[PDB]
């Protein structure tokens, strides 16, 4: 196995132009989409057939509901601190509650708020408390830390509740979020300038996105260049390593790649 | 699914008493305990969701996850605890599950 | 602050009258909540509300309804009193879904033919 991750989002914008929503929630279990919400829809749907097959009408009303609260929360706290900066015009506000279920067995959990997309708030649920990055953090880091109730809630979520939401929807989609589409991983010569030839390690097809390139010798190489891990639009991911063979080096170079429990070497 | 706690309790003044609640579930977000006077609103009386024993006067509050099961204990009884205690958890919708109460009878 | 008020206190109905049941908070709630209790049974929810603008059944919503035009009011409707619906009716307030609810006084209502 390997590691799997269940995060909500919630994205809230005030004054937004025509047709944006002022606010915005999605579900993701690993890089998959399973949920959406916005002010507009006012309405919590499945993102994956998955979902949609296995949660009951009953599921979707109840959260909805929830949602339409958040929304609410959401804009007043963006409003007051709006209000503890200063600041006229849009602002953003976001936050990040997720948990990761590891192969070992073990788990982790993590919490974060974002006012303009930096970091503003982050919650340690083993300590239970809130770091703050400024002094408009802190103020509202010391009403949540005097609420004693409300941190234990959130730790035993992160802990139990979300876990458990993971290994659920883990099962309901386990044909996509369980299965293995191997790497086709080919090198190509190039001279990059007039006698000067440079390699390049490519991969493509494969999921889950996680995937280990680096070119090694005789060894690691210095001077790696990487392509980010990119979606190809089937669901499946493609990504390479580059090096340039200093001259008159005659050396054995080689592509290693490693992806869901397979190490490959490809020489030349 | 259920919540259970024992409908009467009598105890003497100046006592103890354990009013026990247990719950069946797949998803809890917590219990609560409320206290309602005859003829009076429900006041909320304490929060459990981590294992354990919370402690405010009188009045404990302790959490079996395991055993699904919770106790309200007062200590030094007053005739002002005569009382419906209100035995409460949250699933994994939030929805609010409510025991039918204990009738708390404090004799002189 | 107030907490919550619920008014009225008491009402006797006929058969077939319909009531209006008020019910405010002053605290900002988000969450506001019709109850009733009747001797050996839960609280059962007739109907919630996650903040001004929407409204959902409970677990005994017929013969009821809502609504939430404001954060402070959720008012509760008899649409056609009927026996069954003898009982004490508790209105509730929560800051959040998972916080503790402030409820009102009650309301004893009497439904005879």
């Known amino acids: 196995m390997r590691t799997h991750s269940l995060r909500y989002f919630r994205l809230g914008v005030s004054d937004p132009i025509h047709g944006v929503p002022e606010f915005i929630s999605v579900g993701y279990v690993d890089s998959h989409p399973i949920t959406t919400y916005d002010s507009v829809t006012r309405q919590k749907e499945p993102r994956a057939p998955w979902m949609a097959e296995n949660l009951a009408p009953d599921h979707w009303e109840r959260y909805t509901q929830l949602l339409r609260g958040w929304q609410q929360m959401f804009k007043v706290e963006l409003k007051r601190l709006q209000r503890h900066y200063n600041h006229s015009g849009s602002h953003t506000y976001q936050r990040m509650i997720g948990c990761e279920l590891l192969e070992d067995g073990s788990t982790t959990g993590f919490l974060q708020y974002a006012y303009d997309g930096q970091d503003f708030l982050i919650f340690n649920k083993d300590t239970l408390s809130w770091l703050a990055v400024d002094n408009v953090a802190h103020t509202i880091k010391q009403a949540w830390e005097a609420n004693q109730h409300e941190l234990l809630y959130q730790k035993n979520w992160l802990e139990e509740e979300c876990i458990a939401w993971l290994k659920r929807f883990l099962e309901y989609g386990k044909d996509t979020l369980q299965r293995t589409e191997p790497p086709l991983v080919r090198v190509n010569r190039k001279e990059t300038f007039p006698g000067v030839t440079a390699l390049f390690c490519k991969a493509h097809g494969f999921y889950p996105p996680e995937i280990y390139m680096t070119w090694m010798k005789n060894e690691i190489v210095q001077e790696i260049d990487y392509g980010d891990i990119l979606p190809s639009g089937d669901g499946t991911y493609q990504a390479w390593a580059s090096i340039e063979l200093d001259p008159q080096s005659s050396n054995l170079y080689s592509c290693h790649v490693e992806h869901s429990g397979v190490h490959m070497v490809l020489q030349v | 699914q259920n919540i259970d706690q024992p409908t009467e309790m009598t105890a003497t003044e100046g006592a103890i008493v354990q009013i026990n609640c247990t719950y069946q579930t797949s998803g809890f977000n917590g219990l609560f305990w409320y206290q309602q006077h005859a003829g009076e609103a429900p006041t909320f009386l304490s929060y459990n969701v981590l294992d354990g024993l919370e402690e405010k006067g009188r009045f404990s509050s302790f959490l079996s996850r395991s055993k699904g099961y919770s106790y309200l204990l007062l200590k030094e009884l007053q005739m002002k605890d005569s009382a419906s205690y209100l035995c409460?958890?949250?699933?994994?919708?939030?929805?609010?599950?409510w025991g039918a109460g204990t009738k708390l009878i404090i004799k002189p | 602050n107030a907490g919550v008020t619920q008014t009225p206190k008491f009402q006797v109905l006929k058969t077939g009258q319909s009531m209006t049941l008020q019910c405010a908070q002053d605290?900002?709630?988000?969450?506001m909540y019709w109850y009733r209790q009747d001797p050996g049974m839960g609280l059962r929810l007739i109907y919630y509300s996650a903040s001004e603008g929407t409204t959902d059944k409970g677990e005994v919503p017929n013969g009821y309804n809502v609504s939430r035009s404001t954060t402070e009011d959720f008012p509760l409707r008899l649409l056609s009193a009927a026996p069954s619906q003898t009982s004490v009716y508790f209105c509730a307030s929560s800051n959040r879904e998972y916080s503790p609810l402030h409820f009102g006084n009650g309301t004893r209502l009497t439904v005879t033919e």
């Open positions: 605290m900002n709630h988000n969450y």
């Open positions: 409460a958890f949250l699933d994994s919708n939030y929805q609010l599950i």
